[model samples]
Target: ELRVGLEESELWLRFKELTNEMIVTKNGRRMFPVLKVNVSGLDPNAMYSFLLDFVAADNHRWKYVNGEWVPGGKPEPQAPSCVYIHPDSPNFGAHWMKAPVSFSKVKLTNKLNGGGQIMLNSLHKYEPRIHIVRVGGPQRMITSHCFPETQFIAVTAYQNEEITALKIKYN
Candidate 1:
């Protein structure tokens, strides 16, 4: 059996309330309110690999209008999907369950040349997902989860003035 839960959900909700905006540049930007989680209900002796992937949250292109994100039009062609494997992967389940899981090291970039970085589109909403895979075991298992509350819009520049204001007020 496999189970996954998001960690620090209250904190994530606070950011989500302000419309969590992740800054994506030509290089890359580490996600704020990083995707942290907790894993349990796994074999203690089994080794597991954690991976993160992003998917479009909606099909529409978003534009800031009158202080809110409105559907501007159809989204442009999206970049190829990418997966970010946690650096501490392939460790025992005991290790994972012993501490809070964090994907703080994962980053988003608009450039294709960035090595091993997840590529994303500007001005599009995306949902980050966590995948847990059991490796080198008699029976391999794969489980994943996505938190709708952690969804955010990716942008090269701050389109929503409210998000900028929140960033300034908090940071």
Candidate 2:
């Protein structure tokens, strides 16, 4: 069976239980806790490309009140969507398995024109997904993997001090 594992799984969980907050500015910031992954059961000699995308985890938006968050309302119209292919894509699967695939460089932004950074709606939570495209497997297959624990709420600034302090401590 093909498997994709979230690297630093427990680290993401620590952030998840607190409802992780990713501060997205108009300028953009690298996603903290980073998204590194591992893949197994891939054809060693086959070519593959890795894709990254985000999906809204909730239909409604979010609000912070009295030190906690709540459903604010329906989400605003979304920004233009994008699929960021890994820079070292279109390589044999052998290369991917050499080490954990690092997506640590990706950044989140609330506005467009961020030097190719991802655009997200502030106040909404997004689930990041990884897609593996196999080349010439009789039928090319696209395998998708998403870690529920990796989901995060996009904010302009940090809200919870507990979350904020942990971010610093972990760094």
Candidate 3:
């Protein structure tokens, strides 16, 4: 297995820097560190499902209090779970990867409608996970693989200073 550390990866650094810009209140900000991965070891004829999720930093859920966002003081009874679907799928995969290999770009969103939360603590950290699925023919596709889990992954801190240093290290 190959391992890539954030401190050594330029891509990670570049994304860290991008998230540092101020986000307007009532507006949304895009995440700078987008996950771009290359996958191998998949059956070309099979279909796949992809997803993304945001988990809490600690076991406790957080809330906005005393002019700042904090862990609800008490342990949060439950954590919110959000999943994002990849726009590109089996069809796109087959056509796009018809050549020697295949490629897909899955995007995660912070919009309140479909995705999870938008605002995060300045120093909180989070990680992104990718899932891949393989289905049978269209008729029996429903019973196919549900193996979508964390694929190529990235972990990031929410602070501006750390993000700035990350950018310089990468770029």
Winning candidate number (lDDT): 2
lDDT per residue (tens digit) for residues 32-78 in model 2: 88889999988889989988988888767888899998986555655
Instruction: Enumerate residue pairs that collide in model 3.
Output: 48-133, 49-133, 131-149, 132-148
The local lDDT score (0 to 100) that residue 166 gets in candidate 1 is 65
Specify the poorest-scoring 10-residue window by lDDT in model 1. 72-81
After superposition, candidate 2 runs with Cα above 4 Å error:
75-80, 136-138
List the pairs of residues colliding in candidate 2: none
Cα deviation at 158, candidate 2, in Å, is 0.5
- Across residues 48-165, which tens digit of lDDT does each residue of candidate 3 receive? 6545454444545433344344554455433443655555654434532443221133333333443333333322334444445444555432211221122111223233454556
**How well does candidate 1 score on lDDT at residue 58?**
77
lDDT of each: 0.82, 0.85, 0.39
Q: Which ten residues in a row have the lowest lDDT in candidate 3?
A: 144-153
Sort by lDDT, best first. 2, 1, 3
lDDT of 1 by residue, 1-171 (tens): 577888878777877887888898777888777788888887888899998998888777787788887866655666546889999988999989998889888778878854767888777888888889989988888887988888988888887777777667655
Residue pairs with backbone atoms closer than 3 Å in model 1 (clashes): none
TM-score of each: 0.90, 0.91, 0.49
